[PDB]
Amino acid sequence: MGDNIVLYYFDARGKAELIRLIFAYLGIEYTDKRFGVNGDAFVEFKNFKKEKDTPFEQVPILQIGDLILAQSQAIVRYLSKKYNICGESELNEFYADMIFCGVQDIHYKFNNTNLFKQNETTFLNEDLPKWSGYFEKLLKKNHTNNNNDKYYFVGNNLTYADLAVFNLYDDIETKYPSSLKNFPLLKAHNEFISNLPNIKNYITNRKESVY
Amino acid sequence: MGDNIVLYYFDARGKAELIRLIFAYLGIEYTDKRFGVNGDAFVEFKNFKKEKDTPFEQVPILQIGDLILAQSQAIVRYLSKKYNICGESELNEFYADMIFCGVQDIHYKFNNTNLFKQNETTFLNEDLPKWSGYFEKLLKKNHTNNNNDKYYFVGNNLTYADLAVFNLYDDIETKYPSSLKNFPLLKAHNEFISNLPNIKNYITNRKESVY
Amino acid sequence: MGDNIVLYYFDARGKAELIRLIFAYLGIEYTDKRFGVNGDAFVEFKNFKKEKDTPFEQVPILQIGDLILAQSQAIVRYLSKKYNICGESELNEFYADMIFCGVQDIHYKFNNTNLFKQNETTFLNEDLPKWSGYFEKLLKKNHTNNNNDKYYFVGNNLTYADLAVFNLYDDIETKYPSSLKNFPLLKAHNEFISNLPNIKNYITNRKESVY
Amino acid sequence: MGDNIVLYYFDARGKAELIRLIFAYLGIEYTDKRFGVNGDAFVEFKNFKKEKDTPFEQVPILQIGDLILAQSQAIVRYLSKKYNICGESELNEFYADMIFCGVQDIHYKFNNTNLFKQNETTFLNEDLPKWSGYFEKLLKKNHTNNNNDKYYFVGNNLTYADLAVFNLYDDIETKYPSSLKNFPLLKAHNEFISNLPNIKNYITNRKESVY
């Protein structure tokens, strides 16, 4: 609100990419500060915590004016509620929330998956297909036949849940094969969201990050 | 709303206890259905998923009338927002949310701590004191000197965040020593919340659960 | 020569039970020192580390004379090689080893499973059945000595691998009963081991520990 | 006798690199078979399991002649005992073992650390410094052969324990540089191992793997 917007995080997608996608979709201009660009990523982060008054010594940290906001999920809901992309009814606000909570679950699982731990096949053969099925079924329940051209998990308008699900699979795809092949609506939903003007432009401009 | 309220979960506190505390504090009557009471906990859960249409095949599941709500965090925010215990300003609604997100972090850490994994001393000597410090500092920022008798993390009224922090330490205490000794406000806050009529009565009546 | 043996660990089964089972089987005399029998286990553990020179500040610690041994797996292999329960050939020593490594994987998974984490169903229906099948097949392979009343994983004599598998299911069983119904060889192996006079006498005596 | 040796694993360092380092050190000829060099690594892994009889459906798998060996730790101990790099006494065999067990603990922690999980700072400032100190002290204890240019963790000859510690920091280093600045013995040990002709030649040849 007439205040300089500054997002603080490491030079990576991680837990800040959904926030970035929200700004990109909303056309909100802000300073995307990334650690590890000026100097040692962890030296910068250490000094950051010294200069900024963070509640839990974690990033992302979103600063609006002199207002300091922490916790990625809280930030996402805060921005979504303020910019009306969280549902237009007490029930829909809940559904978008419930879907995001689900996203967090499987997204965490993905980020906890790696060769060293020998849990890659489980994630690929058990966990991902199961959750993809959950999301496929949720998308179907929000009747797509009405206006097929549009794919939304909640109501008839885009919510942060749509961006969260997209970001989930977008992140997974950077490391593992595209499996959406077996989930039509979901596959369609992701294509739809990615091709949105603001989103499509954003993606094309962001640099490739390993994390 | 004029509908029978039914909470479904296992016979344990786990991820459903904050919801139970919310009902207890709000004086809302509901059916507290617990698996493992009528038969094999997992047999019941299996059949439950067959009869109820859950979005992610997880509990807790809160059913209001024929309305099915999943995801503990979403349920907590839904109930809190509806029963006005989530903050009275866009900013305070955010703060209570941010604090709850923090609670989830350390609560997860606690539940991931055990002898077999050899991470007990780290939790007790590093993680818990650090987070207790975060919460102590947050409580202090919400000026307690005003009405010392009252301890709230957000605004001048109770929010679900107050119940979440209480539940966090209440759960930890069941397995590990009371460490709040070094955190006055926090220690005071928990005593205050626990002694609330509805809460105090609830606790005294609930059976002792290992989880 | 005939040094004095002392095992230091918390007052629980955890990672020390396999070592205790080995002693019980071999009929070896030792002092089973447990932290927190009467006081605070962690204050005692803190003092233990200050008084004894441990390599990684972890227990179990086995002291034979003035010799201090650490790392549960290394201790198990040390005792097994010293008291002939490790295999009578290079290949068999390897097989007993390979099996113990497998046990560690699933035993760790079991101890990382809990209600809060919502991974109980996964463990029960995916992970455990899979690993039980691995063990069933390995036992089947070594069936020349599957003698009517004696089952060994390696060769024709008991190895620590046999005690490790027994311990594994013994531990699981105290939380998730009847896991061996569909695995006859494994069930018979468990029965056989649990009925060896020394092991049986030990089990009937040790107290019940939740951990 | 002079069987044909083949190591099967993904096209990455992961849990197979220590075995490869052992072969490199010993100058042993073998086929380093990697999944997904050109195609899909998981389709190839799926086919591998269908074509070869593995005990736990995991890799690495080492085949010598028709002999199939599994479980990385057991394989390392098998090769080390067979090619004399495991210690020349019962006690020293134990010490090399104990050290390797310690390495597994911290190596696993490292591979469980990442931005998404917000546990990087913890690993860097708490865990790694602590474990580096454990190793520094262990190396200091065995300083009768700390000879001007040769450092061994056990006895006066190289053991797999030496290669394991080298591999550990080598892996960490590709993500978190300069971890050995404050640990002179450990740094000197790493330098020494990395400069052995066979090891050096190997390192200069192997390709760069993110995993």
Long-range contacts of A113-121 (CB under 8 A, 24+ apart): A114/D111, A114/D211, A115/D10, A115/D12, A115/D14, A115/D15, A115/D211, A116/D14, A116/D15, A116/D107, A116/D108, A116/D111, A116/D211, A117/D108, A117/D111, A117/D112, A118/D15, A118/D58, A120/D42, A121/D42, A121/D45
Cα distance from B65 to chain A (closest Cα, Å)?
14
How far apart (Å, rounded) are the C-alpha atoms in residues B180 and C200? 44
| Two tokens, residue B108 | 């997860």
Nearest to D189 by CA among D159, B136, D198, D174: D159
| Two tokens, residue D99 | 């050290």
| Two tokens, residue B159 | 């929010």
How far apart (Å, rounded) are the C-alpha atoms in residues A54 and C129? 46
Q: Is A118 left (phi over 0), alpha (psi -120 to 50) or beta?
A: left
Using a CB-CB cut-off of 8 Å, the residues of chain A touching D111 are 114, 116-117
**C-alpha Rg value of chain D to the nearest Å:** 18
Q: Is C178 left (phi over 0), alpha (psi -120 to 50) or beta?
A: left
Contact between C62 and C7 under an 8 Å Cβ cutoff? The reply is yes
Q: What type of residue sits at position D6?
A: V
Tally the C-alpha atoms within 13 A of residue D35's C-alpha that lie toward its C-beta. 20
How far apart (Å, rounded) are the C-alpha atoms in residues D47 and C146? 32
B129 prior amide bond cis, ω within 30:
no
Q: Is C6 left (phi over 0), alpha (psi -120 to 50) or beta?
A: beta
How far apart (Å, rounded) are the C-alpha atoms in residues C17 and C34? 12
Angle at the Cα of C43 from the Cα atoms of C42 and C44, rounded to 5 degrees: 85
Strands (E), chain C: 5-10, 31-35, 61-64, 67-70
Tally the C-alpha atoms within 13 A of residue A48's C-alpha that lie toward its C-beta. 28
| Two tokens, residue A100 | 């995001």
Q: Say yes or no for a CB contact (<8 Å) between D10 and A42.
A: no
| D104 annotated among ligand-binding-site residues | no
Using a CB-CB cut-off of 8 Å, the residues of chain C touching D101 are 71-74
| A59 annotated among ligand-binding-site residues | yes
Nearest to B116 by CA among A117, D103, C111: C111
| A104 annotated among ligand-binding-site residues | no
Q: What does DSSP assign to residue A91?
A: H
- CA distances A124 to A9, A106, A175, B57, C90, Å, are 29, 11, 11, 19, 37
Contact between A163 and A79 under an 8 Å Cβ cutoff? The reply is no
Query: Which chains neighbour D (Cβ–Cβ under 8 Å, 3 or more pairs)?
Result: A, B, C
Contact between C46 and B125 under an 8 Å Cβ cutoff? The reply is no
Chain centroid to Cα C192, Å, comes to 16
Domains of chain A plus CATH, in order, are: 1-85 (3.40.30.10), 86-211 (1.20.1050.10)
Beta bridge partners of A159: none
Query: What does the DSSP assignment read for D27-89?
Result: T---EEEEETSSS-HHHHHHHHHHHS--SSS-S-EEEETTEEEE-HHHHHHHHHHHTT-S-SS
Q: What type of residue sits at position A101?
A: C
Using a CB-CB cut-off of 8 Å, the residues of chain D touching A117 are 108, 111-112
Contact between B62 and B54 under an 8 Å Cβ cutoff? The reply is no
Place of tokens 């998404």: D116
How far apart (Å, rounded) are the C-alpha atoms in residues C19 and C164? 9
Phi, psi of A153 (to 5 degrees): -75, -35
CB within 8 A of B10, min separation 6: which ones?
Answer: B16, B34, B35, B36, B41, B45, B59, B211, C115
How far apart (Å, rounded) are the C-alpha atoms in residues C131 and A64? 52
Contact between A25 and A196 under an 8 Å Cβ cutoff? The reply is yes
How far apart (Å, rounded) are the C-alpha atoms in residues D51 and D47? 6
Nearest to B46 by CA among B38, A141, C111, C183: B38
Q: What type of residue sits at position C170?
A: D
Report resolution (Å) to 1 decimal. Answer: 1.9
Chain centroid to Cα C10, Å, comes to 15
Using a CB-CB cut-off of 8 Å, the residues of chain C touching A122 are 126
Q: Say yes or no for a CB contact (<8 Å) between D77 and C97.
A: yes
How far apart (Å, rounded) are the C-alpha atoms in residues A185 and A136? 6
- Secondary structure of chain A: what % helix, strand, coil (to 5)? 55, 10, 35
